[PDB]
Amino acid sequence: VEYTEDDPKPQIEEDCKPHCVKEWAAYKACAERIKDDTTGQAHCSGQYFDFWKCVDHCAAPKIFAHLK
Amino acid sequence: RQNIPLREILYQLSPYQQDVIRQTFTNAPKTFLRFFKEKGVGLATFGVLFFGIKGYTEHEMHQERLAERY
Amino acid sequence: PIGVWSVFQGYVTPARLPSIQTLTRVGAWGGVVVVGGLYMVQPWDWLA
Amino acid sequence: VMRLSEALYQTFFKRSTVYIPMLLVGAYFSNEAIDYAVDKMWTTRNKGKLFSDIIAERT
Amino acid sequence: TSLLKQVALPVFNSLATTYRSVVGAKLAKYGLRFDDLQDPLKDEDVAEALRRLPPDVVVARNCRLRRALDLSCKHEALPKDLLEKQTPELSYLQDVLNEVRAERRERAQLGAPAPYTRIYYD
Amino acid sequence: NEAADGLHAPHYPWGHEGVLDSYDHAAIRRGHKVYQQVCAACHSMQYLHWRQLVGVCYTEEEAKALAAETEVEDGPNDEGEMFTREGRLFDAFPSPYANEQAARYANGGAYPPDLTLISGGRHNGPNYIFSLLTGYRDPPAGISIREGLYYNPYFPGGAIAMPKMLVDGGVEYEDGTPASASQQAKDITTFLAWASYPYQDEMRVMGIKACLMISILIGFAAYSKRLRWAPIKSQRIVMDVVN
Amino acid sequence: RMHNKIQLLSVLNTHLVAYPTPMNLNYSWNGGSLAGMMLASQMLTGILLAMHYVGHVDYAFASVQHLMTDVPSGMILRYAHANGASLFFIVVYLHVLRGMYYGSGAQPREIVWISGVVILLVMIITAFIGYVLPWGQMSFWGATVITSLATAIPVVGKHIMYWLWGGFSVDNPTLNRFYSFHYTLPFILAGLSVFHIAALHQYGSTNPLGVNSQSSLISFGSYFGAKDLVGALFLALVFSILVFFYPDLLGHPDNLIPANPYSTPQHIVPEWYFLWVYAILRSIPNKAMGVLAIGLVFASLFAMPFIGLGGGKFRIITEWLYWTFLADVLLLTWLGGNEITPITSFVGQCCTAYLFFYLLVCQPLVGYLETQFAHG
Amino acid sequence: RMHNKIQLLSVLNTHLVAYPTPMNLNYSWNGGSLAGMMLASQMLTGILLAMHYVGHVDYAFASVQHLMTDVPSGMILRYAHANGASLFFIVVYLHVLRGMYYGSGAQPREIVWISGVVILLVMIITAFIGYVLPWGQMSFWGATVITSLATAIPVVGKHIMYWLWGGFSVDNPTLNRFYSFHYTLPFILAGLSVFHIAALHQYGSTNPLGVNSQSSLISFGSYFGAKDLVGALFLALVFSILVFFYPDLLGHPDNLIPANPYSTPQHIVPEWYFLWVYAILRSIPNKAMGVLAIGLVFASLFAMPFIGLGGGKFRIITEWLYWTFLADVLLLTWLGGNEITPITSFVGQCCTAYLFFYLLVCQPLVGYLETQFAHG
Ligand SMILES: CCCCCCCCCCCCCCCCCC(=O)OC[C@H](COP(=O)(O)O)OC(=O)CCCCCCCCCCCCCCCCC
Ligand code: HEC
Ligand code: HEM
Ligand code: HEM
Ligand code: HEM
Ligand code: HEM
Ligand SMILES: COC1=C(OC)C(=O)C(C/C=C(\C)CC/C=C(/C)CC/C=C(\C)CC/C=C(\C)CCC=C(C)C)=C(C)C1=O
Ligand SMILES: COC1=C(OC)C(=O)C(C/C=C(\C)CC/C=C(/C)CC/C=C(\C)CC/C=C(\C)CCC=C(C)C)=C(C)C1=O
Ligand SMILES: COC1=C(OC)C(=O)C(C/C=C(\C)CC/C=C(/C)CC/C=C(\C)CC/C=C(\C)CCC=C(C)C)=C(C)C1=O
Ligand SMILES: COC1=C(OC)C(=O)C(C/C=C(\C)CC/C=C(\C)CC/C=C(\C)CC/C=C(/C)CCC=C(C)C)=C(C)C1=O
């Protein structure tokens, strides 16, 4: 395969993002539900981790296919 | 050295008048099945208890992590 | 077996147990251990 | 059924002082063969990745 | 306790018969009996009961133990014709051992010890 | 807590993972060049010497020329003073700071750790290193980052003091390999994985020989065990007991 | 005849060559020879490593690294020592579980079981102080957490803690005295092993049938030397795999960071072979009660030859309860490696209670019922 | 009996309480128990010392100084461990001279004598490599002079020398391995001592009369416990005097200078108990011949039960010759601390020749003449 001077990883990560639409919906639901917070402790790190774990598991073997 | 009263006839053959490992291939599946027949109940109750308690604990730990979310 | 088998076989009777005088004289070694520890550490204000 | 030869027994097996040097030369050659097989398999599998492959490539 | 301990004995007897059935099925393949499972090294009363026996009974007990240990080394069981003849519950030791233990219980109520010790080697 | 644990890293198909596989020594060479130009401004690697790179990564003359471009403090001379000299093969890799306190002072209080054993010193070592280097993502909702800190969900706690350092084309490889950020990260991760386990190839070759030899010896010992026990396993006992 | 002329030939012949042994011993009777071989391996590789280790807080980690990279065969020796400790604990734990399954501690072998429990306690202390020697993060912080259990003793707790440390914290005198104690305790283990083996030779071994075996005895040297060689080669295979292919599999990555007394790790855990004791300690929310529970576990281990009834295959109720005990101790091993959590606290408490129930209630009482079932 | 039911109590009773001993043993039979007490004292003091010693160059001297001035009771421990080696060698030398005087190695006690000679060799090696550890001028230069004497074996010389050093000169690897070897060797000394005592118990001890004493034997544990305690109290008095009043009397002042590989001291002499071997080596003007003579002395020591005829009194010619041998050995001890001079070279050569003459000519031939005179 042809190796590119530009970074292929953001494009591959964007490609796997339709495969994890459910986790993205859960994260956006969390982000909407803590919008009116005032205590500064509400966060959505767990659903964010779920979405990025799904995307990472998709994109991991396709990232090293494009690298020497 | 601990005299034992006993009445018997004992026979023994030279180890160079019989085979060494040829019967080991014939008896190997039978010995496998006999081992699992003899130790089946204990290994099963060990596996059931260990994996059931571990699975229940891991499930409730995951529920505990989910309960901390916002 | 000698520990609990002897209790279960009925071999431990009051007539076979040590006497109360024997238990008094054996248990007097407890004061020896206390005074030995006090001699070793000397952790007192007892001398005055 | 299968049985060790008598003439081969009388030469390399009847005395320990003849058996032991034969044992040592057989041990030497067995180690050489095992070394050769392991090294050949490793170099064949990992061809193009070793340092010597890069050095011989730059010649 | 006496009101419920009148009928707690048949349940004990049923459990004991089931236990002896299972273990005697296990024992009969080795040609053993229930009394062969008692070790003179493990118990000094059994060591005392064994020297109160006639010599042919001791010779038979040693023969059965030797056959069972040989079978255990060979990873074998008895053949079917021998296995159908096995009597795992034919006692040869329980009467003598019960007498020995009753004598030891009798001596202990009067403060006396047993007139024997453990088997000591070396 | 999940946020304190951080995001786990996926399992990448490294070419050296199997017990039959060697390192990619071309990637070690390209990984060292990322170390010299990007890493070594703030990371020490104090247990490496130029002598250990010979035969793995460079020839003797290349490593000598690399070491001779560094300034190494030496002494004392006959006048009891400290001077500088050219580095040699026995010299260790230069440290960017003299001590931990100036390293903390140059980096907002955080000490950039030594990278000789950072691969074996982290759980899921190479995968965590690669995902940390290529993983400076946007923070999720409700997570704010103070000044001097940057978000990285692979770092435990999510707030790291190391900024984004790998950029496209920021290293000019000498073998013609195009240097994207991911290629640079993969090469430096390979070099760090070599740094934690420098003798992995030799260990695996010795392990293959040992496993083969012991597996043959198990069969020979089983043969000699069964030969000795044969007069007992086939003995005939006849007695008068029937039961 | 020639061994009749020298004492040392006679003792060796009697106890190694012509010693009678039951002919039906299976491969569960190989744990003792393997444990002795692993002790000899640990002593040899430790003596060889001591020629390059420096017991000072400024040079300990650096000398470990220098031994790893620059000393010829130093990586083999260091990995062999660190993984031979784990294989030593595997072999000893399987040996103890064999004794628990067969009831081998019973009369006339109470001395063998008691010297075994003494050996196991010395082994635990030896491994714990050996782990501090690399002076990594786990090495520092585990020694800090465990030696801080002495303050659970009232009045004189902190004084004993400071006396063991040599100061107000774990520092260089702790490392130096730990190095001396660690060099010393394996020789006590060798002496204890010689005494333990000579205690067993008074009466002999038990057999898998659980019956008296004096009618069927064969020589040890001709027959069980080869049978022990087979198991030694199976152990050497696992040893080779662990040394060469997965050397940090049974370790922790935090012990490759140098020790820092001002930043603790997030998950301080011991080696795997101390995890069940650690789970017993963590399950109880009281330090004194946890230390007492560990002491009561070891007291119940000492009291096994006098409260335990019930043995091998023909005693079937205790034979079935053995597997429940084994599942309980492996659940304790798994629970020690996990973080503190209400469900893990509850499950650890229940598992500790079941271990005490099995040791102190099942072994006397169920053993007595099955003796009454079989011979009443 | 209570000791008849536990096998540990039976062995201890048989070999320490009820062991039959001749009743006419004088105070020259207390050498062995004193040697065992000194071995135990050295082991205890050293294990305590190793908790404050660092076995690295540029830390060893400073760690010994920190031990001396900052560790509570550390000066007592160091001076006790230093002078205990001297007292250990005094006691063992007097023990060997007792055995030489009475012919104690003869039939049937040849194994006792041989195991004693092995113990003496291990003691010499242990004391030498322990003397290297403080890393002073005497330590470094004695280790240099002795280990660079393997260049006398042809061809395979400097290869063995450089493998011993771990380099090209005595440096940090040599000190680091000497620490491990020195820690380890006293446990071999303790095991060899146990074997040595067990070899004597097969036949029991000789008596000052030199006759069979089976008719007049008494219990060890009552009669020879207090008799050993008296001699132990004398040894404790001498030990306390040496530690508290003259702690540096038996040493060398040059060992209080830190080691310098580029500057050598004017006079390089070992400790006093090595001086007779040093005089034998230094008297012969050839290195290989000196090493051959040193080996021949110990070979003649091993061959003594098979060539030595003649015991204590009632064998009066060999009894008188013993005092010439004692004077010869003490002269060799005095000559080793002097400088190399033609008269001292001549006298040392004559003393070495007479030592070999007594060990190899007087003991067989004069002993045979005595037997022909007495019973011929
Ligand atoms: C949320 C997080 C998700 C995590 C997902 C991964 C979890 C671990 C992987 C999956 C494990 C499950 C299958 C494990 C099979 C292992 C082999 C085995 O068991 O064989 C041994 C054993 C083999 O016997 P042998 O061959 O005779 O040795 O097999 C058995 O005897 C059967 C064991 C069945 C008992 C365990 C069943 C699973 C427990 C789940 C309990 C859930 C409770 C829910 C309560 C709350 C409800 C609201
Ligand atoms: C701007 C200076 C700087 C540069 C250049 C730099 N680092 Fe970092 N690095 C840091 C700091 C500061 C930390 C510690 C941050 C913290 O612990 O919060 C760190 C931490 C790390 C860690 C460990 C993170 C952890 O979880 O412990 C690794 C691995 C690492 N750096 C590798 C690299 C690599 C690879 C490069 C080159 C691409 C590099 N560093 C370049 C400053 C730097
Ligand atoms: C005479 C015998 C022994 C000596 C001289 C010795 C010496 C040493 C030394 C110097 C170290 C530090 C070097 C290093 O960390 O790699 C060490 C580590 C260690 N030793 Fe030993 N040892 C001996 C026996 C034992 C025994 C019997 C055990 C039993 C379990 C043991 C367990 C350990 C452990 C767990 C470590 C830590 C290994 C690590 O994680 O790096 N040692 N030993
Ligand atoms: C360094 C540790 C140990 C060594 C070298 C060792 C050695 C041995 C050996 C060689 C045997 C004879 C054969 C065998 O059963 O394998 C034996 C038997 C035995 N050991 Fe161990 N052992 C050790 C630890 C232990 C421990 C920790 C225990 C128990 C807590 C123990 C309890 C026993 C018992 C009860 C027996 C007799 C079993 C029987 O013969 O049926 N040992 N030991
Ligand atoms: C640490 C070193 C030693 C210890 C602990 C030791 C211990 C003993 C003991 C306790 C005795 C019995 C009591 C006595 O006669 O003193 C004895 C006797 C003896 N020892 Fe030593 N000894 C040591 C060194 C030596 C050496 C170096 C030699 C000879 C080269 C030797 C040769 C003998 C002989 C021949 C006897 C028998 C004396 C007789 O019964 O007449 N021993 N030893
Ligand atoms: C387990 C036993 C022993 C241990 C751990 C041990 C330990 C040590 C240590 C750590 C040192 C260096 C510190 C210092 O010199 O003050 C030392 C020095 C020394 N050792 Fe020991 N030792 C033991 C037994 C012995 C024995 C049995 C002998 C004599 C036969 C001996 C003779 C010496 C000598 C002569 C020195 C030199 C002391 C000096 O001049 O300062 N050691 N030992
Ligand atoms: C039927 O049952 C039996 C077994 O089971 C099948 C056995 O296996 C054995 C044989 C026992 C073995 C192999 C175990 C090893 C024994 C011990 C005591 C282990 C401890 C010993 C060590 C570590 C020796 C190392 C120390 C040394 C050499 C001293 C230091 C000196 C130098 C380095 C020079 C016996 C007798 C037995 O009856
Ligand atoms: C990473 O680290 C860690 C360890 O390590 C590997 C551990 O094990 C443990 C936990 C282990 C437990 C609970 C079992 C072992 C327990 C103890 C108390 C070990 C015994 C050691 C003690 C008390 C140290 C004192 C040393 C002495 C007394 C020296 C011996 C000398 C003489 C008796 C004279 C933890 C938590 C740990 O996080
Ligand atoms: C001033 O100079 C001198 C010294 O210095 C202070 C001396 O001491 C000595 C005294 C030494 C003599 C007579 C020789 C000592 C004996 C031997 C065998 C040499 C020691 C050998 C070594 C160190 C080889 C390495 C082996 C080690 C460390 C242990 C081996 C292990 C086992 C046996 C298990 C003399 C003469 C000397 O003039
Ligand atoms: C000719 O007649 C005889 C003598 O002449 C009158 C003797 O003298 C002796 C031997 C004397 C002995 C055995 C006593 C002297 C002491 C020795 C050898 C050892 C010294 C030990 C001491 C003081 C205590 C050591 C303490 C401990 C705790 C170490 C043990 C370690 C552990 C338990 C782990 C014998 C046999 C004899 O026949």
Q: Which residues contact E68 (CB under 8 A, 6 or more apart)?
A: E30, E31, E32, E36, G209, G211
In a 3-state reduction of DSSP, which class is residue E5? coil
Q: Which residues contact F33 (CB under 8 A, 6 or more apart)?
A: F171, F173, F174, F187
H or E stretch at H223? helix H220-244
Cβ separation of E59 and B31 shorter than 8 Å? no
How far apart (Å, rounded) are the C-alpha atoms in residues G339 and G345? 9
Q: Could you tell me how far CA E110 lies from the centroid of its own chain?
A: 28
Handedness of CA H369, H373, H374, H375 (dihedral sign): positive
Instruction: Using alpha carbons, list the distances in angstroms from residue A34 to A27, A28, B68, E18, E66.
Output: 11, 10, 14, 66, 80
Query: Which residues of G are documented as binding site for heme b?
Result: 81, 95, 182, 196
Neighbours of G301 (CB within 10 A): 18
Which residue matches tokens 């030592």? H355
* Cβ-count burial C6-40 (b if 16+ within 10 Å, e if not): eebbebeeeeeeeeeeeeeeeeeeeeeeeeeeeee
Residues of G within 8 A of C3 (CB-CB) are 303, 305-307
Handedness of CA H127, H131, H132, H137 (dihedral sign): negative
User: Tell me, what amino acid is at A1?
Assistant: V
Which residues line ligand 5 at a C-beta cut-off of 6 Å? H 29, 31-33, 35-36, 39, 92, 95-96, 99, 102, 104-105, 109, 112-113, 116-117, 119-120, 193, 196-197, 200, 205-206
How far apart (Å, rounded) are the C-alpha atoms in residues F29 and F187? 8
Angle at CA of residue E91, ends E86 and E95, nearest 5°: 175
Pick from H228, H236, H239: which is nearest to H33 by CA?
H228
Pick from G103, G317, G303: which is nearest to E39 by CA?
G103
G54 contacts G71 by C-beta, under 8 angstroms: no
User: Tell me, what amino acid is at A7?
Assistant: D
How far apart (Å, rounded) are the C-alpha atoms in residues H148 and H81? 27
First to last CA, chain H: 51
Give, as one character, the DSSP assignment of residue F49. B
Pick from H171, H165, H147, H158: which is nearest to H260 by CA?
H171
How far apart (Å, rounded) are the C-alpha atoms in residues D49 and F57? 11
How far apart (Å, rounded) are the C-alpha atoms in residues G96 and H203? 41
In a 3-state reduction of DSSP, which class is residue G270? coil
- CA count, 13 A, side-chain hemisphere, F174: 10
Both tokens assigned to G367: 């053993």
H72 contacts H236 by C-beta, under 8 angstroms: no
Q: Is F32 exposed, middle or buried (0-12, 13-18, 19+ CB in 10 A)?
A: buried
How far apart (Å, rounded) are the C-alpha atoms in residues B13 and E105? 52
Of the residues G227, G254, G287, G319, which is catalytic? G227
Both tokens assigned to H105: 């190695």
Which residue matches tokens 């002269």? H331
In a 3-state reduction of DSSP, which class is residue F229? coil
How far apart (Å, rounded) are the C-alpha atoms in residues G361 and G332? 19
Neighbouring chains to E with at least 3 Cβ pairs closer than 8 Å: B, C, F, G, H
Which residue matches tokens 């060899």? H192
Q: Is the shortest distance between the CB of H29 and ligand 10 below 6 Å?
A: yes
E110 contacts C15 by C-beta, under 8 angstroms: yes
Neighbours of B67 (CB within 10 A): 7
Pick from E32, E38, E23, E116: which is nearest to E71 by CA?
E32
**Torsions phi, psi of H165, nearest 5?**
-75, -25
Q: Could you tell me how far CA F91 lies from the centroid of its own chain?
A: 20
**Torsions phi, psi of F109, nearest 5?**
105, -20
Pick from G346, D45, G299, H276: which is nearest to F20 by CA?
D45
H or E stretch at F3? helix F2-5
Both tokens assigned to H260: 């310098």
Angle at CA of residue B25, ends B23 and B30, nearest 5°: 95
H or E stretch at H234? helix H220-244
Of the residues G41, G139, G252, G271, which is catalytic? G271
How far apart (Å, rounded) are the C-alpha atoms in residues G258 and G64? 11
G83 contacts G242 by C-beta, under 8 angstroms: yes
Q: Which residues contact G339 (CB under 8 A, 6 or more apart)?
A: G267
Neighbours of B49 (CB within 10 A): 18
| Alpha-helix residue ranges (DSSP H) falling in chain E | 8-28, 44-50, 55-74, 80-83, 94-109
Q: Is G43 exposed, middle or buried (0-12, 13-18, 19+ CB in 10 A)?
A: middle
Both tokens assigned to B11: 């026979």
Tell me, letter by letter, the H, E, C secondary structure of G10-76: HHHHHHHHCCEEECCCCHHHHHHHHHHHHHHHHHHHHHHHCCCCCCCCCCHHHHHHHHHHCCCCHHH
Residue whose CB lies within 8 A of the most ligand 3 atoms, among G182, G192, G242, G256, for a mutation test: G182
Catalytic site includes residue G201: yes
Pick from H20, H15, H25, H14: which is nearest to H206 by CA?
H25
H78 contacts H162 by C-beta, under 8 angstroms: no
How far apart (Å, rounded) are the C-alpha atoms in residues F150 and F162? 7
Instruction: Using alpha carbons, list the distances in angstroms from residue F135 to A4, F39, G77, G334, H90.
Output: 19, 17, 39, 32, 74
How far apart (Å, rounded) are the C-alpha atoms in residues F233 and E70? 8
Pairing of the two strands B9-11 and F236-238: antiparallel
How far apart (Å, rounded) are the C-alpha atoms in residues F208 and F53? 25
Question: Which residues on adjacent β-strands are paired with residue B10?
Answer: F237
Residues of G within 8 A of B60 (CB-CB) are 343
Q: Which residues contact G27 (CB under 8 A, 6 or more apart)?
A: G227, G231
- Measure H40 CA to nearest chain G CA, in Å: 14
In a 3-state reduction of DSSP, which class is residue F160? strand
Give, as one character, the DSSP assignment of residue H4. G
In chain F, where do the E strands start and end? 71-74, 83-86, 150-151, 159-160, 236-238
Both tokens assigned to F106: 């140059």
DSSP G125-147: HHHHHHHTTT-BHHHHHHHHHHH
User: Tell me, what amino acid is at F134?
Assistant: T
Q: Which residues contact F7 (CB under 8 A, 6 or more apart)?
A: A49, A52, A53, A56, F153, F154
G22 contacts G213 by C-beta, under 8 angstroms: yes
Instruction: Using alpha carbons, list the distances in angstroms from residue H22 to G38, H99, H198, H217, H218.
Output: 45, 16, 17, 5, 6
Cβ separation of E69 and G313 shorter than 8 Å? no
**Torsions phi, psi of F121, nearest 5?**
-95, 5
How far apart (Å, rounded) are the C-alpha atoms in residues G271 and G132? 12
Angle at CA of residue F208, ends F207 and F211, nearest 5°: 80
Give, as one character, the DSSP assignment of residue H319. H
Resolution, in Å, please?
A: 2.8
Ligand lying closest to the C-alpha of residue B42: 1
How far apart (Å, rounded) are the C-alpha atoms in residues F177 and C9? 86
Q: Does B23 touch chain E (CB under 8 A)?
A: no
First to last CA, chain E: 50
Q: What is the CA radius of gyration of chain B?
A: 27
DSSP G305-373: HHH----STT-HHHHHHHHHHHHHHHHHHHHHTS---HHHHHHHHHHHHHHHHIIIIIIIIIHHHHHHH
**Torsions phi, psi of F36, nearest 5?**
-70, -35
Q: Could you tell me how far CA D45 lies from the centroid of its own chain?
A: 21
How far apart (Å, rounded) are the C-alpha atoms in residues G89 and G76? 20
How far apart (Å, rounded) are the C-alpha atoms in residues F30 and F173? 7
Q: Which residues contact H179 (CB under 8 A, 6 or more apart)?
A: G50, G51, H55, H133
A54 contacts A19 by C-beta, under 8 angstroms: yes
How far apart (Å, rounded) are the C-alpha atoms in residues H359 and H322? 10
Neighbours of H295 (CB within 10 A): 10
F173 contacts D3 by C-beta, under 8 angstroms: no
Both tokens assigned to G195: 């005494």
G243 contacts G76 by C-beta, under 8 angstroms: yes
How far apart (Å, rounded) are the C-alpha atoms in residues H198 and F87? 63
- State the Cα torsion H210-H216-H219-H225 to the nearest 10°: -50
Question: Which residues on adjacent β-strands are paired with residue H258?
Answer: H136
Q: Does B29 touch chain G (CB under 8 A)?
A: no
Task: Using the atom order of ligand 4, give the atom closest to the CA of residue G117.
Answer: 30
Pairing of the two strands G217-219 and G20-22: antiparallel
G329 contacts G355 by C-beta, under 8 angstroms: yes
Which residue matches tokens 């460079």? F58
How far apart (Å, rounded) are the C-alpha atoms in residues H300 and H307? 9
Q: Which residues contact H60 (CB under 8 A, 6 or more apart)?
A: H53, H54, H133, H134, H135, H175
Breaks (C-N over 2.5 A) in chain E follow: none
Both tokens assigned to G71: 């000393």
- Measure F168 CA to nearest chain A CA, in Å: 6
Q: What is the CA radius of gyration of chain A?
A: 16
H64 contacts H53 by C-beta, under 8 angstroms: yes
- CA count, 13 A, side-chain hemisphere, H320: 4
Breaks (C-N over 2.5 A) in chain B follow: none
In a 3-state reduction of DSSP, which class is residue G193? helix
Question: Which residues on adjacent β-strands are paired with residue H136?
Answer: H258
Both tokens assigned to H224: 């020879």
Neighbours of G13 (CB within 10 A): 16
DSSP G329-347: HHHHHHHHTS---HHHHHH
Handedness of CA G213, G215, G216, G218 (dihedral sign): positive
How far apart (Å, rounded) are the C-alpha atoms in residues D28 and F18? 30
Task: Using the atom order of ligand 1, give the atom closest to the CA of residue B39.
Answer: 27
H or E stretch at H219? strand H217-219
- State the Cα torsion F57-F59-F60-F62 to the nearest 10°: -90
**Torsions phi, psi of H218, nearest 5?**
-130, 165
DSSP H186-204: HHHHHHHHHHHHHHHTTT-
Whole-number Å distance, alpha carbon H30 to ligand 10 midpoint, is 11
Which residue lies with its CA nearest to atom 15 of ligand 6? Answer: H134
User: Tell me, what amino acid is at B47?
Assistant: G
Catalytic site includes residue G254: no
User: Tell me, what amino acid is at F20?
Assistant: L
Pick from H181, H351, H168, H170: which is nearest to H277 by CA?
H351
Residue in E30, E63, E67 to test binding to B, most B beta-carbons within 10 Å: E63
- Asked if omega into A18 is within 30° of 0 (cis), the reply is no
Q: Was H252 annotated as part of a binding site?
A: no
